[PDB]
Amino acid sequence: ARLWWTLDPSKYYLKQISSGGRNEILFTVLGVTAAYWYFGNKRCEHYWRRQIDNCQSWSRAQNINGNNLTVKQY
Amino acid sequence: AESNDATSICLESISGTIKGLQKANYVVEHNPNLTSEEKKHLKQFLVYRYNPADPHDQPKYVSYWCDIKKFPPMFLDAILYIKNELDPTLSIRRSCREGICGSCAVNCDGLHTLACISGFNRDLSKPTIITPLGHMFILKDLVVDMTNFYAQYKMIEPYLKRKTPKPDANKEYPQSPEQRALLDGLYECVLCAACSTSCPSYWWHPDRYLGPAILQQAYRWIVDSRDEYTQERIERIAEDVRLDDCQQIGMCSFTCPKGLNPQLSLKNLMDMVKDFRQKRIEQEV
Amino acid sequence: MRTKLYNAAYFLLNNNESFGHSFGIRLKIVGLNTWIVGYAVSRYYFSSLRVKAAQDERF
Amino acid sequence: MNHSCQKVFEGFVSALYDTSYFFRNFGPFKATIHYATYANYLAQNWAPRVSYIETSTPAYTLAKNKYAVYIVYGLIGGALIHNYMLDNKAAQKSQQYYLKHRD
Amino acid sequence: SLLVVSGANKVGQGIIRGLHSSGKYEKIVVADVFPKYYYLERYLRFKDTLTQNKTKLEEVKLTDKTDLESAIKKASHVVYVTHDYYYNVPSKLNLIKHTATLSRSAGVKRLVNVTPVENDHYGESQAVLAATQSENEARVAFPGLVELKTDLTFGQDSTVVSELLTRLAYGKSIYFKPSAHRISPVHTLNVAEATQRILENNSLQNLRYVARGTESFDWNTIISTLAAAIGKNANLNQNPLENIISPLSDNIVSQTVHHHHYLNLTRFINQYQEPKQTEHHELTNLGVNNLVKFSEFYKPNSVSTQDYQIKTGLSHWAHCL
Amino acid sequence: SLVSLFKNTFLKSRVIGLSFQAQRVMAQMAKTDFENPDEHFLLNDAMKYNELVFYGRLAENWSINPELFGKAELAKYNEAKQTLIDFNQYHALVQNLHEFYWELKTIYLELSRGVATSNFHNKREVTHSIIESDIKNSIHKYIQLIDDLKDYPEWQHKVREEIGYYAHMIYTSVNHDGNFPEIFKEFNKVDSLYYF
Amino acid sequence: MFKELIHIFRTYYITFRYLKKSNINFLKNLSYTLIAYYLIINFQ
Amino acid sequence: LPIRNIQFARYHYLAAVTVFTYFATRCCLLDYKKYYPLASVKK
Ligand SMILES: CCCCCCCCCCCCCCCCCC(=O)OC[C@H](COP(=O)([O-])OCC(O)COP(=O)([O-])OC[C@@H](COC(=O)CCCCCCCCCCCCCCCCC)OC(=O)CCCCCCCCCCCCCCCCC)OC(=O)CCCCCCCCCCCCCCCCC
Ligand SMILES: CCCCCCCCCCCCCCCCCC(=O)OC[C@H](COP(=O)([O-])OCC(O)COP(=O)([O-])OC[C@@H](COC(=O)CCCCCCCCCCCCCCCCC)OC(=O)CCCCCCCCCCCCCCCCC)OC(=O)CCCCCCCCCCCCCCCCC
Ligand SMILES: CCCCCCCCCCCCCCCCCC(=O)OC[C@H](COP(=O)([O-])OCC(O)COP(=O)([O-])OC[C@@H](COC(=O)CCCCCCCCCCCCCCCCC)OC(=O)CCCCCCCCCCCCCCCCC)OC(=O)CCCCCCCCCCCCCCCCC
Ligand SMILES: CCCCCCCCCCCCCCCCCC(=O)OC[C@H](COP(=O)([O-])OCC(O)COP(=O)([O-])OC[C@@H](COC(=O)CCCCCCCCCCCCCCCCC)OC(=O)CCCCCCCCCCCCCCCCC)OC(=O)CCCCCCCCCCCCCCCCC
Ligand SMILES: CCCCCCCCCCCCCCCCCC(=O)OC[C@H](COP(=O)([O-])OCC(O)COP(=O)([O-])OC[C@@H](COC(=O)CCCCCCCCCCCCCCCCC)OC(=O)CCCCCCCCCCCCCCCCC)OC(=O)CCCCCCCCCCCCCCCCC
Ligand SMILES: CCCCCCCCCCCCCCCCCC(=O)OC[C@H](COP(=O)(O)OCCN)OC(=O)CCCCCCCCCCCCCCCCC
Ligand code: HEC
Ligand code: SF4
Ligand code: F3S
Ligand code: FES
Ligand SMILES: [Ca+2]
Numbered sequence A: 001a002r003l004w005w006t007l008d009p010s011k012y013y014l015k016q017i018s019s020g021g022r023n024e025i026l027f028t029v030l031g032v033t034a035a036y037w038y039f040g041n042k043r044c045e046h047y048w049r050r051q052i053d054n055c056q057s058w059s060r061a062q063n064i065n066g067n068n069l070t071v072k073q074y
Numbered sequence B: 001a002e003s004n005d006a007t008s009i010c011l012e013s014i015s016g017t018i019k020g021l022q023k024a025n026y027v028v029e030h031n032p033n034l035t036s037e038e039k040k041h042l043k044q045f046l047v048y049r050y051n052p053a054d055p056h057d058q059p060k061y062v063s064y065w066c067d068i069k070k071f072p073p074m075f076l077d078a079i080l081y082i083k084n085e086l087d088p089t090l091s092i093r094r095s096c097r098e099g100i101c102g103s104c105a106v107n108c109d110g111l112h113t114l115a116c117i118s119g120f121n122r123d124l125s126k127p128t129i130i131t132p133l134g135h136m137f138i139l140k141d142l143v144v145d146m147t148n149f150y151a152q153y154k155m156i157e158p159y160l161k162r163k164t165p166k167p168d169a170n171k172e173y174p175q176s177p178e179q180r181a182l183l184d185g186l187y188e189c190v191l192c193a194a195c196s197t198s199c200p201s202y203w204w205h206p207d208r209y210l211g212p213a214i215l216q217q218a219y220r221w222i223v224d225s226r227d228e229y230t231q232e233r234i235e236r237i238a239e240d241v242r243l244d245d246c247q248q249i250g251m252c253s254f255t256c257p258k259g260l261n262p263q264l265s266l267k268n269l270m271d272m273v274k275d276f277r278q279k280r281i282e283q284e285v
Numbered sequence C: 001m002r003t004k005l006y007n008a009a010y011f012l013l014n015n016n017e018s019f020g021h022s023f024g025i026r027l028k029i030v031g032l033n034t035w036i037v038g039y040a041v042s043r044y045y046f047s048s049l050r051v052k053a054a055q056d057e058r059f
Numbered sequence D: 001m002n003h004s005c006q007k008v009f010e011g012f013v014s015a016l017y018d019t020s021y022f023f024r025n026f027g028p029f030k031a032t033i034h035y036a037t038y039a040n041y042l043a044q045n046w047a048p049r050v051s052y053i054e055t056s057t058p059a060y061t062l063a064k065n066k067y068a069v070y071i072v073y074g075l076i077g078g079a080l081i082h083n084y085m086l087d088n089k090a091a092q093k094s095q096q097y098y099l100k101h102r103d
Numbered sequence E: 001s002l003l004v005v006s007g008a009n010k011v012g013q014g015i016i017r018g019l020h021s022s023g024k025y026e027k028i029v030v031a032d033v034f035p036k037y038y039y040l041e042r043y044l045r046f047k048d049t050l051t052q053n054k055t056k057l058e059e060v061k062l063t064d065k066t067d068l069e070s071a072i073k074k075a076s077h078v079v080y081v082t083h084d085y086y087y088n089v090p091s092k093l094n095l096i097k098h099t100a101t102l103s104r105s106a107g108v109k110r111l112v113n114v115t116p117v118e119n120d121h122y123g124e125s126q127a128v129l130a131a132t133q134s135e136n137e138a139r140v141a142f143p144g145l146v147e148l149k150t151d152l153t154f155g156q157d158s159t160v161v162s163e164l165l166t167r168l169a170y171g172k173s174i175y176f177k178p179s180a181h182r183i184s185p186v187h188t189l190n191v192a193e194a195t196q197r198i199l200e201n202n203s204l205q206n207l208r209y210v211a212r213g214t215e216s217f218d219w220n221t222i223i224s225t226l227a228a229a230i231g232k233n234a235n236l237n238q239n240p241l242e243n244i245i246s247p248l249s250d251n252i253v254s255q256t257v258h259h260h261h262y263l264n265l266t267r268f269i270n271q272y273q274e275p276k277q278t279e280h281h282e283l284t285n286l287g288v289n290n291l292v293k294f295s296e297f298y299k300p301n302s303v304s305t306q307d308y309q310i311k312t313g314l315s316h317w318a319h320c321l
Numbered sequence F: 001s002l003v004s005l006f007k008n009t010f011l012k013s014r015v016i017g018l019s020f021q022a023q024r025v026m027a028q029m030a031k032t033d034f035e036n037p038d039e040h041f042l043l044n045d046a047m048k049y050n051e052l053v054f055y056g057r058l059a060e061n062w063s064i065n066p067e068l069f070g071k072a073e074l075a076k077y078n079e080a081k082q083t084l085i086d087f088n089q090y091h092a093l094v095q096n097l098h099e100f101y102w103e104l105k106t107i108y109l110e111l112s113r114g115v116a117t118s119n120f121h122n123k124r125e126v127t128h129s130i131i132e133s134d135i136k137n138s139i140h141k142y143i144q145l146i147d148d149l150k151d152y153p154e155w156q157h158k159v160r161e162e163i164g165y166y167a168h169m170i171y172t173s174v175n176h177d178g179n180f181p182e183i184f185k186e187f188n189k190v191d192s193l194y195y196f
Numbered sequence G: 001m002f003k004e005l006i007h008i009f010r011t012y013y014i015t016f017r018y019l020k021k022s023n024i025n026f027l028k029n030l031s032y033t034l035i036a037y038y039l040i041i042n043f044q
Numbered sequence H: 001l002p003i004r005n006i007q008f009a010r011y012h013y014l015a016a017v018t019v020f021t022y023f024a025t026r027c028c029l030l031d032y033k034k035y036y037p038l039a040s041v042k043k
Helices: A025-047 B006-022 B073-088 B147-154 B177-181 B200-204 B212-225 B230-237 B251-256 B261-283 C016-047 D003-025 D027-045 D065-103 E009-022 E038-045 E065-073 E094-105 E127-141 E160-170 E186-199 E219-230 E241-247 E250-257 E260-271 E316-321 F002-018 F023-032 F039-041 F050-059 F070-116 F129-147 F153-173 F183-190 G002-012 G021-042 H006-025
Strands: B027-029 B043-049 B062-064 B105-108 B113-114 B128-131 B138-140 E001-007 E027-032 E056-061 E076-083 E110-114 E145-152 E210-212
Touching: A025 D065, B006 E076, B006 F183, B043 B073, B073 B128, B113 F023, B128 F023, B147 B212, B147 F153, B200 G002, B212 B230, B212 B261, B251 B261, B251 C016, B251 E065, C016 H006, D003 D027, D027 G021, D065 F129, E001 E009, E001 E065, E009 E076, E009 E186, E027 E038, E027 E065, E038 E056, E038 F002, E038 F070, E056 E065, E065 E094, E065 E110, E076 E094, E076 E186, E094 E110, E094 E127, E127 E145, E127 E241, E145 E186, E160 E219, E160 E260, E186 E210, E241 E250, E250 E260, E316 F002, F002 F070, F023 F039, F023 F050, F023 F070, F039 G021, F050 F070, F070 F129, F070 F153, F129 F153, F129 F183, G002 G021, G021 H006
Parallel strands: B027 B062, B043 B128, E001 E027, E001 E076, E027 E056, E076 E110, E110 E145, E145 E210
Antiparallel strands: B043 B062, B105 B113, B105 B128
């Protein structure tokens, strides 16, 4: 059998762009900005929460037809 | 007038496979009128027989009991004794009789080899089985269709190509004894295909993958110092899986009756192809 | 046209050390990869199973 | 196969081939496929990367191409650590706010 | 036939014009890397400024050594002209060695290496010695090679002089750290004439020449002369950004702020030293005795700004495209 | 017209830059076989292949603004545009030949699956009529193609060596009885002798 | 790795021979995209 | 020939393979519901 395992990068994808190295910083800036936005939203939603349980938290239920939900004691 | 036959063909295929597994190695006695006492003095050859030209014939082993004290001790001698004395309808290729032409390559009792320079088990108890090369289409008896082998051989351009004119035309392309011994043990191939019919990569991909023998010939024409199309040949053999399919099993060097080492040649070819791929990038810059 | 046939080589070749040595490595790698993929599939399958229901329950 | 089923099968495969050919070679569809193929090629074979073949003498290689990896690592690590610190600060702020509001 | 290696350069353009306007050379082929389309467009739009003759003109892109070798194989005379690009280009040193080697491999009647100082890459350690060693190695690879090291070129076929004229005309500041060594400008026309003589004469037991235009000048004197000729005033070291970043440095910010060609220009101004060596023979030995005097060429008000206009607004970014 | 300036600059840059590469890409495509003519570009190195394929359409279709072009520049752009159109036609031709090759290889693959050792479920002794007709018509088209390439010896030789290989393998897959003489009548003239 | 899996399937399965190098490349691109999506999503 | 940041590429590929395998197989996050019958109890 032939040995083929290796961690080295393939030369097919190792080319540079004409003006220099590949667009690494430009894409990393976008990635960092997107991560900042996403994690900021997640943190804001997560931390500023409380559960308030009282009569005003309950409303009258209804069917998908909009009528009030009541089930008989059949 | 004809109709769909998927179901009938499927049922017949399954049933035939099962029955053949039950009745594998079907054998027919050439001469049933033999007293078991006589068979003590005679050795048994099971010879594969099949005549696709005849629509009523099917493959089968035929059992021949022969006195091994009537002909020399080689597979070809026994085959020809059977043909001439017992049944002259047997078919086999034979030209040289001294292991040079390479036409008589067959599966001599479990190993691909030339039948003319291969002995057989002298013991009278164990039977000897002679069958054609394994993965080659069978034309008749021990004759296979080696046409594809030759067609592949043609694709390597096995002729000296030179890009530089000879300086004087009254001399011979100079080549020192070292550049000649570089070919020793590499130009003796007789194109018997015994090795290539034993290469599993050649079993699986007969067409896309050239055999060990053809690749060894390409290596012979590459390492030759007189030719100047080294890189061109390397690139040509580097396409798809013409060479990459080799898995270095090494059976090719084990079966070669001539003692050659196609495995080493293929290994060197792989190294040269890798270097060619790398330095197509490294050099041109 | 009667299609031609052949005798598969591996059915009629005496077992050799080269076949064993090479196919051993190939089977080692095949077993490794198959084991990994099958473990992944097994975890997926078992996690896909439903929860136990009561006795003689409809819906 | 039966020649009637042969007619049906030939017609069906001809219809499939014609449908595929029309859909691929129609003007707008052809343009869409042609542009999307190149977009996919750009994405797959020219994605952002940190390792690349250096074919230029040290005098002819920019500094950006010698410290791009370090800049990327700095950006990513700083983003992660700053997000962690922001999470801790938000935890403290929320705790203090809801504590001072009641209990 | 002629192959002009790295001819897109302004000095290369001048030499190409000189060779094209002198008949002969049934086919002239210009080979260059052409990094960005701006340079190719510049060369092509120069190609309009040529009186049409029998000579045919063609362009070749030196993407890899295969192209260079193929072009050389189809040539009888070769004229190498350093380069004009810094960063993301093969080299100014390996290129000449490869040219010499390939030329020797496929027999070439004549190989002339023009090496203007203004084009050498002065952003590397021991730039002048690096260039000298590159020339020596190239000569070793091709003993019959002819050498012609020019010393600052003016006229509309120059790199540094044209750059300075554009800067002064637009009022751009100039980071100026002059070196003490004197300068001797040479009109590119005289360089083209010398190249013609080298290509035609043959024999030529003397294989080292230098293009040196009599009158000597200090760097400050040259800038003063150019400013007088263009009709503006020099703005030396007038940009605080330059003072802070010091384009003489090669840090990340310096490279990513200023134009690379401007960096090399100021580094050349700072690291300039006379090219003439005891082994060179002046162009007077090639018969070119009527050299164009630099001072008389750039008389006051003898240069018009409109010959150096550039795109200013976002249209300028079309160059980066 | 700033947008016009940018459009024309983009077109000029891309088209002229690729025109200097079309020779190399076309030569590489010729070098490989017809099974996957773009094999080298997919596996080893994409030497501006996808770029040529994409920008050929733009060269053909997108308009030009000569007032934004010089004289020599406009001549060069027209030359490059013609080169890209030539590449378009060349790619179309190679694609057609490659698809015909794959037709023949499909026929051969059906035969091989028929004679495969693992095929314990679909083993057929006698070739059926449909595949015979397919073989006959495919060989007829192949012979017509070989005839049509009489003015291009290199192309004719490549078409033979590549496509006719599977025709030869199909020839070897079956016995010489039944309708075999009629099916391979055209193949037996010259091609059969070549593949021996 | 992916290359090796495709090579094994091509060399052992006769039916898989039907696929071109182009189709194999399309599968390669889709698999890479799915792997990137998997890596990204698991952390979300 | 030289490859910029080759070691970084090797380690990035190794990390990608490790993370993908970890999430696909969940090798580290086993299930212990099968061991509960074979475990002692407290309280
Ligand atoms: C971000 C949010 C918005 C995203 C919007 C995306 C929209 C995409 C629409 C695509 C439409 C079809 C396009 C057809 C092609 C037309 C353009 C063209 O031909 O190229 C021109 C131009 C030059 O091409 P070329 O001359 O042929 O050069 C290549 C040659 O080989 C010659 O090479 P060379 O050596 O000469 O060098 C030339 C160099 C020249 O290149 C450049 O100059 C470009 C450099 C980068 C941009 C620089 C400018 C930055 C500032 C832009 C500011 C814009 C402001 C906009 C304001 C708008 C206000 C309204 O070329 C390159 O290097 C090409 C770069 C390719 C980058 C590909 C990126 C792939 C990955 C993307 C996703 C990454 C996710 C990571 C997540 C990881 C998390 C861990 O290239 C481009 O325009 C590049 C575009 C690349 C991206 C397109 C595809 C994006 C797809 C994203 C994934 C979305 C999936 C969603 C699910 C799917 C269903 C929806
Ligand atoms: C020919 C006919 C053959 C018929 C066979 C029929 C077999 C029927 C099987 C029925 C199902 C058995 C399931 C066992 C589950 C075991 C785990 C367990 O208890 O989990 C609890 C399970 C929850 O699972 P989980 O915890 O979420 O995750 C389980 C995972 O396995 C993860 O748990 P873990 O993290 O603890 O995992 C332990 C770790 C352990 O891994 C290791 O460390 C490996 C250690 C290996 C050591 C081996 C030593 C052997 C020694 C060799 C020596 C050779 C010497 C030679 C010398 C030569 C001379 C020198 O990983 C593994 O166990 C590896 C598993 C992956 C397998 C990869 C290969 C897959 C493809 C190949 C399959 C076999 C093909 C054979 C073909 C044969 C052809 C002829 O929940 C239960 O309580 C279920 C209990 C099991 C019953 C399930 C019933 C389902 C019924 C479905 C309806 C259809 C049924 C159809 C039946 C048909 C019958 C004919
Ligand atoms: C849900 C999420 C969605 C978003 C994410 C998506 C992610 C997945 C990827 C999707 C990929 C597939 C996309 C769908 C396929 C679209 C096919 C298509 O366009 O069909 C046209 C195509 C017809 O065009 P054709 O046959 O190719 O051309 C001949 C015609 O006679 C026409 O001849 P003509 O000369 O009269 O007109 C030519 C031109 C109109 O000509 C013009 O007016 C000029 C257009 C711009 C030219 C390029 C100037 C670049 C200047 C530099 C910019 C630098 C920016 C900053 C960065 C600097 C540093 C790098 O019209 C086109 O062909 C437009 C095609 C699309 C844009 C091509 C330009 C690419 C480069 C510029 C954009 C990318 C940025 C690159 C930056 C870097 C560059 C180095 O076929 C159709 O008509 C099909 C119609 C039905 C299908 C849907 C149509 C959708 C139309 C969308 C228009 C979008 C316009 C751009 C918006 C940009 C917003 C920021
Ligand atoms: C529970 C969750 C859900 C599970 C099911 C999920 C299914 C997902 C979708 C699967 C889609 C599969 C089809 C598309 C792939 C490509 C197929 C293809 O090439 O098409 C043409 C090709 C037919 O080509 P052809 O020209 O007709 O054949 C002649 C060529 O020379 C032939 O040349 P060749 O080399 O191309 O042909 C080789 C061919 C294989 O085809 C063959 O040539 C023969 C197939 C039958 C072999 C049967 C065994 C023969 C005897 C071996 C020894 C067994 C000993 C057992 C007892 C041991 C006792 C100790 O290989 C394949 O089929 C490739 C893919 C195989 C794996 C994927 C399919 C797995 C199906 C598993 C369930 C099957 C149904 C239940 C069975 C059990 C019921 C109790 O395949 C088909 O059309 C048939 C497809 C397969 C049908 C099922 C046959 C049984 C397979 C069992 C495999 C078990 C593996 C172990 C793990 C199983 C875990 C579930
Ligand atoms: C219609 C269009 C056509 C559709 C077709 C169908 C398929 C879809 C196609 C769509 C097109 C895009 C497809 C995805 C890209 C595929 C790329 C590919 O296949 O490349 C193979 C190719 C394989 O090559 P290879 O030879 O095998 O080598 C690979 C090795 O991994 C070698 O890798 P490497 O070594 O070069 O590394 C790569 C590099 C790549 O990374 C980057 O540079 C990129 C960075 C992230 C940028 C993210 C930008 C995202 C922007 C998004 C903006 C919003 C978009 C919204 C769009 C909406 C719609 C318009 O990695 C890094 O930079 C490593 C960073 C590690 C950071 C470590 C942190 C350390 C912290 C500690 C610091 C030190 C502390 C010390 C403390 C000491 C205490 C004592 O990959 C590459 O070579 C490129 C690198 C890999 C890039 C992967 C990018 C994946 C992006 C997925 C995006 C999915 C978006 C879905 C959106 C859905 C919306 C609905
Ligand atoms: C090596 C190459 C091949 C590799 C292949 C890899 C495949 C990867 C597949 C990935 C996707 C995995 C999806 C898993 C779905 C499993 C569904 C299933 O059957 O689960 C078991 C289920 C009962 O489970 P559950 O209701 O949860 O009850 C136990 C709870 N403690 O059971 C039931 O409810 C039983 C009813 C549903 C199942 C019906 C199955 C019908 C099969 C018909 C076969 C027809 C062909 C026959 C061929 C032979 C003919 C002679
Ligand atoms: C892409 C790189 C850019 C961008 C973003 C800017 N310019 Fe420059 N510029 C560029 C090139 C290729 C050239 C040609 C230089 C040469 O003659 O070889 C120039 C040139 C100039 C000039 C004239 C020459 C000089 O002054 O050095 C000026 C003036 C100039 N550029 C200015 C300028 C300004 C103000 C920019 C805004 C940031 C700018 N450029 C951007 C390429 C590019
Ligand atoms: S390679 Fe070996 S077995 Fe094959 S023909 Fe040559 S000598 Fe004979
Ligand atoms: S037996 Fe077979 S696959 Fe390779 S090295 Fe030897 S050939
Ligand atoms: S019989 Fe002569 S070599 Fe076989
Ligand atoms: Ca040789």
